Design a protein around this ligand. Structure first.
Ligand SMILES: *[C@@H](C)[C@H]1/C(=C/c2[nH]c(/C=C3N=C(/C=C4\NC(=O)C(CC)=C4C)C(C)=C\3CCC(=O)O)c(CCC(=O)O)c2C)NC(=O)[C@@H]1C
Ligand SMILES: *[C@@H](C)[C@H]1/C(=C/c2[nH]c(/C=C3N=C(/C=C4\NC(=O)C(CC)=C4C)C(C)=C\3CCC(=O)O)c(CCC(=O)O)c2C)NC(=O)[C@@H]1C
Ligand SMILES: *[C@H](C)[C@H]1/C(=C/c2[nH]c(/C=C3N=C(/C=C4\NC(=O)C(CC)=C4C)C(C)=C\3CCC(=O)O)c(CCC(=O)O)c2C)NC(=O)[C@@H]1C
Ligand SMILES: *[C@H](C)[C@H]1/C(=C/c2[nH]c(/C=C3N=C(/C=C4\NC(=O)C(CC)=C4C)C(C)=C\3CCC(=O)O)c(CCC(=O)O)c2C)NC(=O)[C@@H]1C
Ligand SMILES: *[C@H](C)[C@H]1/C(=C/c2[nH]c(/C=C3N=C(/C=C4\NC(=O)C(CC)=C4C)C(C)=C\3CCC(=O)O)c(CCC(=O)O)c2C)NC(=O)[C@@H]1C
Ligand SMILES: *[C@H](C)[C@H]1/C(=C/c2[nH]c(/C=C3N=C(/C=C4\NC(=O)C(CC)=C4C)C(C)=C\3CCC(=O)O)c(CCC(=O)O)c2C)NC(=O)[C@@H]1C
Ligand SMILES: *[C@H](C)[C@H]1/C(=C/c2[nH]c(/C=C3N=C(/C=C4\NC(=O)C(CC)=C4C)C(C)=C\3CCC(=O)O)c(CCC(=O)O)c2C)NC(=O)[C@@H]1C
Ligand SMILES: *[C@H](C)[C@H]1/C(=C/c2[nH]c(/C=C3N=C(/C=C4\NC(=O)C(CC)=C4C)C(C)=C\3CCC(=O)O)c(CCC(=O)O)c2C)NC(=O)[C@@H]1C
Ligand SMILES: *[C@H](C)[C@H]1/C(=C/c2[nH]c(/C=C3N=C(/C=C4\NC(=O)C(CC)=C4C)C(C)=C\3CCC(=O)O)c(CCC(=O)O)c2C)NC(=O)[C@@H]1C
Ligand SMILES: CC1=C(/C=C/C(C)=C/C=C/C(C)=C/C=C/C=C(C)/C=C/C=C(C)/C=C/C2=C(C)C(=O)CCC2(C)C)C(C)(C)CCC1=O
Ligand SMILES: CC1=C(/C=C/C(C)=C/C=C/C(C)=C/C=C/C=C(C)/C=C/C=C(C)/C=C/C2=C(C)C(=O)CCC2(C)C)C(C)(C)CCC1=O
Lengths: 160, 54, 161, 160, 161, 54, 160, 161, 160, 161, 160
């Protein structure tokens, strides 16, 4: 949470919150309604965004599902779609929290190691999450698009 | 009388060891067989049992 | 380092006086810049690896630099130059967000020319690469934000050379 | 080189080279004829060895040559040919030097970073080196095949 | 660092070509010299303390450096000279075994000149001590094998000049 | 299904400033009138008065 | 630039600009409008100016394109035209700057070395520049004609 | 070196193009500056010795700088300081009339800091001298001309420090 | 004369006169009418100009004519008036010539040595020429005031 | 600087020994090569300008170096490059005639890389131009004289790289 | 003459014409019969040699005799034949003297200035002298051919 990040920074400074940190907390608590609305919209429409993004990534990188590939196979495609759903849920967690800390703590720390063990093109995974962000922006309000794209795009950069 | 007309193009520089130009011909000779374009739309797969459970 | 706001504050503090309109207008200018700079930083952090990738692909990739003999040769030197460009992009975004180039001199140009000279790094090749990142970032972000990113990257190149 | 490796170990321990290390250097210099012969054989069969290895790689992992894969066009396949030529040359360098330090210093440290920057599947690169190892073993004597296979296996393991 | 084998390999790799007949011939020459190099290295390792002992005896003992106020006064400083001469002998043996005097540049001559200039160490006296080491080791390992040791100790002396 | 192929050879570069490619076409349009081969013996010239006595 | 020219001339004596130099700087800064105007008037006719000048020069001295000649080939005709274009850009630079310093620093110094190395006739290239000047005077205003013809005259005389 | 006009000329020429609209507006801006710069140069040439005289009288004069221990002591060092001020003023006038600091940083900053350090010169006292030069020039040239002159002198001070 | 100055520069460079020199001489020959007008005005109003400037100089520096001073005595004040006449005529010569060559050659080179020999305060003379500048500017037109002021500024700076 | 004879003499002098069999053999080898070197030097003197012209035409024309942006742009820079190549040819001929590279080492190589880095000129392009001069000279002179010139030219390239 | 060159060098070094030069003078004076004979050979065959030299030169560079070129007119060609005659006579003078001092003092110093004032392609003149050298070498016998070729290609290099 943004409050968790602010309190961590304040503790590292060994004193109470700064005016900037208190302003951040106030703004986040004010905008929590819009943030929760965005999270609920993404959660409700999640299967649509994940499905469309997966299909679009399939067209972008046919190698992923071609024979001899990590995603090749019905079960492998299902596994990749499960990964897409997990990462969408993580982005929802980040949106509700207000900071990318839950994102990193859940699905970005060691993700390179895990996908190296699984033999996966993490760049293609970044393309998949890009498609997820695009579908969410398409089927979400323009104002909400900025907040959703910020966290989706942090995920894209971290796992790119 | 022949009067060899000098041309615009600079004289080509010889290839070195690290250039892939000397391997383009080898790649053409191999002629790798590209995989057939995939047809999996994935719209018919639901994430409930398709994901393995072992 | 210091942002444009801190530069104005320091200029006022040197005289030990309050901020006047001659500083108020420039503060308004930086604030108006504002969302543009933060969006450019957001997009750069978005495709952070990508600009480096295409810039290296267009300037140094498939050339004598990455060939044997060239300083980009060997995977170790390759990763070293890629890490250096990651430095350059991160510090350019830093300077753009702050609105001032002090971070480059205090963090980047401080001893970099001499260290590259000791390492025998091709200064001209590095400058060309960084210019490639400049134009790639401009194309990725737009005209205005691309312009600020380009001016910061060109300051980096001028200091390096 | 074996000499350089033993020298570095002795320098790290702040001591002269031990009698065992001197014996190893003496054995290596005496047996150098076989290593030079192996390097000669590999350099001679460089063309056919790389061609067969790359071809077998292509039907072994067609995704790399597939559309969307890293090496789809003939130009990118040529880039793979150049990479495999590089690694064959490095293996020959290691064979002649008697130690893996030249290979590690040339194309093993930061290879993961290079291939992540290029988008290349390092697993597929390791598979290509494995195919070159197989073709070299076919083209060499059994004991010579083992001696070269030591360095091929080292490169493959470091890549993987 | 580098040796004969690494020198040949780097010479081939700078132009990226494989090993031709000339490189294999140079490697064969080094392998031929390998027996002599190993012999000399083992002998010098066995008699390292002695060699520095007679070098100091016939080059530095009973002199201004050893006299009170001399740089070799103050037994800690004498032990420092003994250790430094042992370092020179060991790294010269390294260079002789490797066949290339790059380990001396990157592990002995790196900052040694500045060290001695800041410490007031007599450079010419050290050079004379190294020459005495060269004579002693040449007499100990013969003229031919002693030739390489003399070459590398001379490299150290010239770098220290 | 665009599947753009990545080419490493630099494609045909646009004619930058100063390239004679930029002027080859208009040179064609100009079409200079090349002078014909003169028919001079250079062997029967009595060089004692053909040299001017100005 | 006449600015830098007078600056250097004054610095040679280590003194500020004389009344004559300052007066000429006055005149140049005042007439910069007409100078830039002639700049556009010559920069707009570049294709026609070079085409007409080169065409006229070709029958002025047919030896340039005659067999065994300097520019007998089509490629060498185009190259001669491209030199014409360079020199026209240089004269435009000089006319705008108000001083022949750009001409000298770009395309006059060592040009005799250039054209003895390439065998091209200096008198012929001077005649080409004269043709450029004639066409420019024809196609531009009268006063602008004299103003640009001054620098065309300088380059023609200096190179020739 | 170069000024604004030669800067636009060579910026165009390096890309090998004619004068585009940006160059035209840059040249128009420089021409608009024009007579103001020439008038400031003429007035400075009028009172050349004046500005240095009252700048010294304001900042350096009657202080420990001109006292024993201070670098201004002795008539030789005093006249050397005056000569330095005359150099700085002529270069400032040249840079003003040109429009660029290339003349200065090619004829000033090259080795100037190190030579003054070798002579043990007070950089702070020098900077104060150029400051007093700036105000005395402003009081004789006006507001905008004085401002641009002060900008050039401030660049000189930054290079000196 | 600026014509002589340009000729000197051209002969030093071993070249014919450049467009800058040609434009300079053209502007001078066209402005010669106004220059001769200024010279005629100065010649006509010389005595009033010199007397008013000398009296303003006296008010600025009374010690110059005080007892024990260089100008003390009616002889030594009439000699100041004569010197001011000489310098005013020199300024007229410089105005009519367009350059400072005659001024530097007749009143500026060796002037410091002459005034050191005679004990004169050259700083006081600079103040006197300044006062002559204001008096001539008052008696003279505004447009030509800047032109005359340029030469007065030159003389003041040099003789300062 | 020293030809083969002077180099042998100086080496023997530094060892403090007369001219033994090896030195006599080397001097006889140089004497045998003398007529070849004289004829090659005469031919290269006859065709010096043509060699540089052809090498530049076949190596360094109609490329980015010649185009604006390349360091050979403008008559000044092109003449500087041509004069550099002429210097290389003449000094290589001197080295060939003297049978030693000391003249190149002390008159050419020293500071060449430093000046090239300072002026930003293309070392790679210079190397290729030297190559082209090598083929032209080999074609004009013959096989063995061509190789003798080429070894010195490649030494120049190696030093400059 | 070789004696004159040796005298000049000895005077420059303040010497007595050391034996290393005295023996050379002795050899030249003894072998002068062959040099004289080559002189009469070239003098007798001057007309023919000049004729084939002009033929070959015009074949290689027809433009110079073209109306655009300098040699056109049937009298410019005559003047080229005349200049070739001068150069052949000069080469004969140099051969008889023993050194190139008469060559450079008659027709090499300022030859570039002469041919620039006449518009002549000095490189074409060098090609013509090359053709003359080839014709003379064909006409004479081996060692005499090389002896003349020394002066010939000296003149060639100086012209180039
Ligand atoms: C499809 C376009 C992309 C792709 C995906 C893909 N992933 C797997 C397998 C796994 N993915 C994960 C990742 C996670 N599991 C978690 O619980 C979380 C925590 C947030 C993450 C990030 C794991 C662990 C697996 C292994 C199975 C498991 O979950 O236990 C596959 C199949 C791999 C296989 O062989 O089974 C695929 C295809 N692969 C691509 O190439 C695309 C970029
Ligand atoms: C008899 C008392 C014992 C003995 C002594 C001995 N010493 C030497 C030679 C040297 N001794 C020193 C000692 C020092 N130098 C210092 O700066 C300090 C600080 C006080 C000390 C203690 C040195 C430097 C030398 C050699 C150099 C020189 O003498 O100038 C000898 C001679 C050995 C030789 O080979 O020359 C001897 C005999 N030896 C014994 O066996 C007794 C126990
Ligand atoms: C890349 C643009 C070019 C290139 C360069 C290159 N760099 C290195 C090594 C290093 N680069 C740096 C630079 C920095 N470190 C910092 O902290 C900063 C700012 C944050 C900078 C700019 C350093 C310190 C090194 C050495 C340590 C390291 O590797 O991190 C190399 C390899 C040097 C070597 O072999 O030792 C190279 C080659 N190479 C190219 O081809 C490009 C033109
Ligand atoms: C082929 C079967 C696999 C593959 C390879 C591939 N590589 C590239 C491009 C490059 N590869 C390298 C590698 C090296 N350079 C070195 O100096 C060393 C040895 C010390 C290595 C290993 C480099 C530097 C490049 C860049 C181009 C250049 O050579 O200068 C490509 C093309 C990448 C692109 O986008 O163009 C490819 C295809 N990729 C796969 O997917 C296969 C598993
Ligand atoms: C045309 C009016 C005359 C003529 C021209 C001619 N020039 C060349 C070749 C070159 N000319 C140049 C000169 C420049 N290049 C520059 O960038 C600049 C500086 C601004 C100058 C002055 C150069 C460098 C070349 C060769 C390389 C290149 O083209 O870039 C040729 C052809 C030479 C050849 O043998 O290829 C010709 C014909 N020739 C005439 O007869 C006219 C009088
Ligand atoms: C008095 C006999 C004459 C005179 C004097 C006068 N001097 C000044 C000011 C200064 N004089 C000096 C001179 C020196 N300082 C040194 O260190 C040295 C050598 C040790 C010398 C020769 C200096 C430096 C100054 C400036 C002030 C200072 O010292 O800090 C003035 C006043 C000038 C002003 O504008 O304030 C005067 C009047 N004047 C006469 O007319 C007498 C003949
Ligand atoms: C006076 C303004 C300040 C000062 C300085 C100071 N300078 C010197 C001596 C020299 N100053 C220079 C500098 C230049 N010479 C140039 O040509 C240029 C550019 C045109 C510069 C900047 C030089 C070269 C010297 C030494 C040679 C000489 O005398 O001309 C001194 C005297 C040092 C000495 O050791 O004698 C001083 C004191 N000091 C102050 O306090 C002032 C603020
Ligand atoms: C031509 C093949 C390449 C090229 C050349 C080039 N060089 C310079 C400038 C200099 N080159 C040297 C080098 C030497 N001068 C010597 O006398 C010798 C001794 C043997 C050497 C090696 C120097 C000293 C300079 C600077 C001084 C000078 O006036 O030349 C230039 C011009 C650089 C400039 O800024 O003027 C050029 C163009 N440039 C290329 O692009 C070619 C690959
Ligand atoms: C002919 C292949 C080339 C050529 C030659 C050419 N020369 C002239 C005219 C003159 N030549 C000279 C002088 C000399 N010629 C010599 O050989 C020497 C001996 C040392 C000298 C001094 C002079 C003075 C003239 C003109 C006056 C005179 O002839 O006495 C011409 C005629 C030029 C004209 O227009 O009259 C020609 C054709 N020109 C080429 O283009 C060829 C490459
Ligand atoms: C594409 C791709 C792959 C997938 C690869 C795939 C799909 C591989 C699958 C290959 C298949 C389908 C192999 C089956 C082989 C069958 C054999 C050997 C049976 C022979 C029977 C015999 C001899 C019996 C004979 C008999 C006997 C003797 C009797 O007694 C009488 C009866 C009978 C006739 C039965 C990988 C997984 C490799 C990687 C990922 C990837 O993308
Ligand atoms: C014996 C005897 C006699 C007596 C005779 C006697 C002894 C007569 C004595 C005569 C004497 C000595 C007269 C002195 C006159 C001096 C004057 C006017 C000073 C002028 C200086 C000035 C104005 C200074 C000017 C200055 C200024 C301000 C400057 O600006 C420049 C400097 C300077 C310093 C020059 C009699 C004749 C009476 C008869 C009877 C008898 O018994």
């Amino acid at each position: 949470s943004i409050v968790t990040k602010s309190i961590v920074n304040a503790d590292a400074e060994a004193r109470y919150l700064s005016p900037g940190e208190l302003d951040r907390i106030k703004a986040f608590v004010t905008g929590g309604a819009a943030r929760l609305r965005i999270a609920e919209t993404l959660t409700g429409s999640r299967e649509t965004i994940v499905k469309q993004a997966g299909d679009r990534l399939f067209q972008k990188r046919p190698d992923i599902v071609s024979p001899g590939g990590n995603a090749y196979g019905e079960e492998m495609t299902a596994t990749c779609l499960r990964d897409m759903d997990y990462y969408l849920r993580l982005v929802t967690y980040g949106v509700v929290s207000g900071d990318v800390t839950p994102i990193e703590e859940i699905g970005l720390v060691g993700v390179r190691e895990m996908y190296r063990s699984l033999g996966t093109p993490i760049e293609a995974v970044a393309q998949s999450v890009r498609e997820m962000k695009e579908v969410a922006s398409g089927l979400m309000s323009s104002d909400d698009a900025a907040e959703a794209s910020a966290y989706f795009d942090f995920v894209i950069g971290k796992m790119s | 009388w022949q009067n060899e007309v000098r041309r615009f193009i600079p004289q080509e520089k010889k290839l070195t060891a690290g250039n892939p130009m000397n391997f383009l011909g080898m790649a053409r000779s191999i002629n790798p067989a590209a995989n057939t374009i995939p047809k999996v739309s994935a719209q018919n797969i639901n994430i409930e049992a398709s994901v393995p459970r072992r | 380092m210091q942002d444009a706001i801190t530069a104005v504050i320091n200029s006022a503090d040197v005289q030990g006086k309050y901020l006047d309109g001659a500083a108020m207008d420039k503060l308004k200018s930086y604030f108006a810049s504002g969302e543009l700079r933060v969006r450019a930083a957001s997009v750069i952090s978005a495709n952070a690896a990508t600009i480096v990738k295409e810039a290296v692909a267009k300037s140094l990739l498939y050339s004598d630099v990455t060939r044997p003999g060239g300083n980009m040769y060997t995977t170790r030197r390759y990763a070293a130059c890629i890490r250096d460009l990651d430095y350059y992009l991160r510090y350019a975004t830093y300077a753009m967000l702050a609105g001032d180039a002090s971070i480059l001199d205090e963090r980047v140009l401080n001893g970099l020319k001499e260290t590259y000279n000791s390492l025998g790094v091709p200064i001209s090749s590095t400058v060309q690469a960084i210019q490639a990142i400049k134009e790639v970032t401009a194309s990725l972000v737009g005209a205005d934000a691309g312009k600020e990113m380009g001016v910061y990257l060109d300051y980096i190149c001028s200091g390096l050379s």
